[PDB]
């Protein structure tokens, strides 16, 4: 209904919901687009600064910088996963009856690889190229679009590290450590219903949420390092500021140190709320049901607000 935040290079945050949203880092609006019925992805953003979202109407949009329409995708099937930006400009997205599909920057079709069953979280890229997904397993497919390997359900989204190893969270609670040529590093086992992508933090920790309200620390030699209890269900990623803080949504929009303590933790409403976007300068976007967007400053108040027009 409303997408998280993705941040620009210049800091403008774009967001997703009855509009494609462009709000400048003071708050105020830059332009809206309208992408066909609804907006249902979270915007990817190109190195060039093309914004793409998928719409209700069934289409892939790419969006100039400026907020005018570059062109659009007529999407087969239904398109379970957002749209991921390849190293060299390529969009990775995949559907409901698990084709993934590489469209070319220019709005034509690359290639399409069928799995088995559906594809219902995003790709990752590795520093090669190399596309990685779950699904029934985890899938390594080269950029030409032939598969690399596969690794033995997941519905999160996987994490790579600088060094290439490839990090999942299974729905039984295991995370895996894969090394690039797809043969098991280490698996630690949480015995907990995992819904929550992990993200890579401060000195390669891994992070991720359990579904009954512990954020995990998991160290990279595949040792826990803590744990921190909300009494609220995880159910989405969290992120990392640059001074290595994490921040994640449950009830609130928590900020966790380094060393496993509450920083401070801030209220955006009744609605669930998403993953919290990082600016370079530490602000913190986050985006609740109803079409806010918040802007918090690192020291937990609230910088602005932003409404959206249809909510
Ligand atoms: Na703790």
């Known amino acids: 209904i409303t997408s998280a935040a993705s941040i620009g290079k210049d800091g403008t945050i774009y967001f997703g919901s009855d509009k494609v949203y462009a709000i400048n880092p003071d708050g105020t609006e830059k332009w809206n687009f309208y992408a066909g019925y609804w907006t249902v992805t979270r915007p990817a953003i190109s190195e060039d600064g093309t914004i793409y979202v998928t719409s209700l109407d069934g289409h892939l949009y790419a969006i100039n910088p400026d907020g005018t329409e570059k062109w659009r995708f007529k999407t087969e099937k239904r398109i379970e996963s957002s749209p991921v930006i390849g190293n060299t ?3 990775y997205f995949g559907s409901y009856d698990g084709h993934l599909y ?3 920057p220019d709005g034509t079709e690359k290639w399409r690889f069928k799995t088995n069953d559906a594809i219902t979280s995003a790709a990752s890229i590795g520093k090669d190229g190399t596309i990685y997904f779950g699904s029934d397993k985890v899938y390594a497919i080269n950029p030409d679009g032939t598969e690399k390997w596969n690794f033995y359900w997941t519905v999160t989204r996987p994490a790579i590290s600088e060094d290439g190893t490839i990090y999942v969270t299974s729905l039984d609670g295991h995370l895996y450590a894969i090394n690039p040529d797809g043969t098991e590093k280490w698996r630690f086992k949480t015995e907990k219903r995992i819904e929550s992508s992990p993200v890579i933090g401060n000195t390669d920790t891994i992070y991720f949420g359990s579904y009954d309200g512990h954020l995990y620390a998991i ?5 826990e390092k803590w744990r921190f209890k909300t009494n609220d269900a995880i159910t989405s990623a969290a992120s990392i500021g640059k001074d290595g803080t994490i921040y994640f ?5 928590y900020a966790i140190n380094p060393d ?3 920083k401070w933790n801030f209220y955006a409403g009744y609605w669930t709320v998403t993953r919290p ?3 370079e ?3 913190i976007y986050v985006t609740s049901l109803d079409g806010h967007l918040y802007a918090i400053n690192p020291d937990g108040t609230e910088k602005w607000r932003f409404k959206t027009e249809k909510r």
Do not use: C, F, L, W
């Not at 160290?219 to 040792?223: F, K, M, R, V």
């Not at 949504?249 to 929009?253: A, C, E, N, Q, T």
């Open 260 to 262: 496993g303590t509450e």
């Open 102 to 104: 590489a469209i070319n």
């Open 89 to 91: 400009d390529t969009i």
């Open 277 to 279: 976007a990082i600016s």
């Open 249 to 253: 949504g449950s009830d609130k929009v």
């Open 219 to 223: 160290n990279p030699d595949g040792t």
């Open 281 to 283: 300068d530490g602000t």
